[PDB]
Structure formats: C-alpha cells, structure tokens
Amino acid sequence: IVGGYTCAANSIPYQVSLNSGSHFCGGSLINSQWVVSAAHCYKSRIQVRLGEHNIDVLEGNEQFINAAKIITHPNFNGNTLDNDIMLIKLSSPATLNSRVATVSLPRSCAAAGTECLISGWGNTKSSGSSYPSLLQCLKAPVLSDSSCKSSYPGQITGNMICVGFLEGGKDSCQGDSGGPVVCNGQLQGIVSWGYGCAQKNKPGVYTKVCNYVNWIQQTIAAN
Ligand SMILES: [Ca+2]
Ligand code: NA
C-alpha cells in the first residue's frame, strides 16, 4: 500500500497473509473454512496466516493453517486479468474471535463514490521498494466506471472496478495482490492489477466481487 497508514493491530480481522516461505499475497476470510484471493496469486502450496499484524514476529494471535484446496476461477484469463479470483479451503477451520473474523460478501454492487478500506503487506514505496512488517491500510473511493475506463481504454471488463485516486500517491501495490477492498462492511474488491502503483491517472483495478457471490457459494457448497 503506497500512501496509506499502519492499521491498528488486528483491526482488519478478515485480512490474511498467504505465505510460501514468505508473504506473497493477501486474502480475505469469508467463511470459517474459506479464503478468497486473486487467481494471479496462484501457487500449488500455500500456508494461510490469519490474525497477523506483524508478519515478521509471532505476537500470539496468529493461526497458521495450510491450504487443502486451491481453486482458481475457471474463466480466469491471465492476459486481460478477467475473473481474477481464487478460493482457498483451509485444512482446518479458522477459529473465529475478535482478531480473526469473516467479512460479508456483497449484498449489492457499490455505488460510485462509496468509501472503502484497502489493506495489505505490499510495497509501500512509490519509487524503490519497502515491504512492511505491519499491516497497511488505505481509505479510497470507488471510482466512476467511466473514470476507470478512461484510465485503461478497452481493458476494463464488467468484472472490474477502479478504487483510488487519479492524482496518484495512494494505491495498492505488488504484495497487496489478492487482498481486500471492503466498503460498508462488504467485500467489494480483490486487489488485481494496474500499471505500477500510485501513478497519476492509473488507479488500482480490482476484481468486482459483487459479480461472483454465486460462484463463491457454489464452490464452497461443492467442497
Ligand atoms: Ca505476527
Ligand atoms: Na495500481
């Protein structure tokens, strides 16, 4: 997250870290047994780390649980990044408490201008790289479907939204990938793609979660 702030410890209790030797992507706890993330985050081995604030130190609220099943959307396209969504089944259920909690799926798609919270352990530098120990947070609005489409001519499908700021300086980045965009208590976005991060007139592009509630519920029911 470029241009954000350090979240309060455990204030984003649905945020997970996907680990394979080190942190590589975010995800969101949506059921005791399921995490949703980005298909471009796919790896064949993943350990989900729940209840994190400092990914570099054990603080006592963590639950480390290996992925049992990893299911990319069957229409994921790695070129256009259409359908950039992935489900992870936990090998044992997460234990839900104040520090590890589910986030609601969308009841509806979000209006343009809806305020959201974007979080993760991605790059914090707009020039160079610095990967934080501590979970970063960003307040950002859903941009007009228009203002999204002007930024990326012919590249915004019906399954994508832009969230952020056209002036630059505030965005998700590499390593925030797969993480949450939560707007009025609903998971509306998954960190997906862009053109670098925090650049002028290049807002983050997010998987539009309100198109996927059927696919998510069907996939959970089937496994
Ligand atoms: Ca920790
Ligand atoms: Na971006």
Out of 17, 151, 177, 192, pick the active-site residue.
Answer: 177
Q: Is residue 51 located within the same domain as residue 112?
A: no
Q: Is residue 74 located within the same domain as residue 168?
A: no
SS3 content of the chain, % helix, strand, coil (to 5): 10, 35, 55
Alpha-carbon dihedral sign for residues 140, 144, 148, 151: negative
Q: Is residue 110 located within the same domain as residue 206?
A: yes
Q: Is residue 176 located within the same domain as residue 116?
A: yes
Q: Which residues surround ligand 1, an ion (CB under 5 A)?
A: 52, 54, 59
Out of 23, 37, 82, 84, pick the active-site residue.
Answer: 84
- Long-range contacts of residues 215-220, Cβ cutoff 8 Å, at least 24 apart: 215/73, 215/85, 216/30, 216/36, 216/87, 216/105, 219/71, 219/87, 220/31, 220/33, 220/34, 220/87
Q: Is residue 86 located within the same domain as residue 124?
A: no
Query: Domain tally for the chain?
Result: 2
- What's the domain range around 69? 13-102+211-222
Candidates 184, 190, 191; CA nearest to 209 is 190
Q: Is residue 62 located within the same domain as residue 136?
A: no
Active-site residue 73, yes or no? no
Q: Is residue 168 located within the same domain as residue 187?
A: yes
Q: How was this structure determined?
A: X-ray
Q: Is residue 127 located within the same domain as residue 138?
A: yes
Q: Is residue 160 located within the same domain as residue 96?
A: no
44, burial (CB in 10 Å: exposed 0-12, middle 13-18, buried 19+): exposed
Q: Is residue 170 located within the same domain as residue 98?
A: no
Q: Is residue 137 located within the same domain as residue 93?
A: no
CA–CA gap between residue 5 and residue 55 (Å, rounded): 16
CA–CA gap between residue 7 and residue 172 (Å, rounded): 14
| Rounded distance from Cα 29 to ligand 1 centre (Å) | 17
| Rounded distance from Cα 49 to ligand 1 centre (Å) | 9
Q: Is residue 3 located within the same domain as residue 110?
A: yes
Resolution (A): 1.7
Q: What is the CATH number of the domain that holds 169?
A: 2.40.10.10
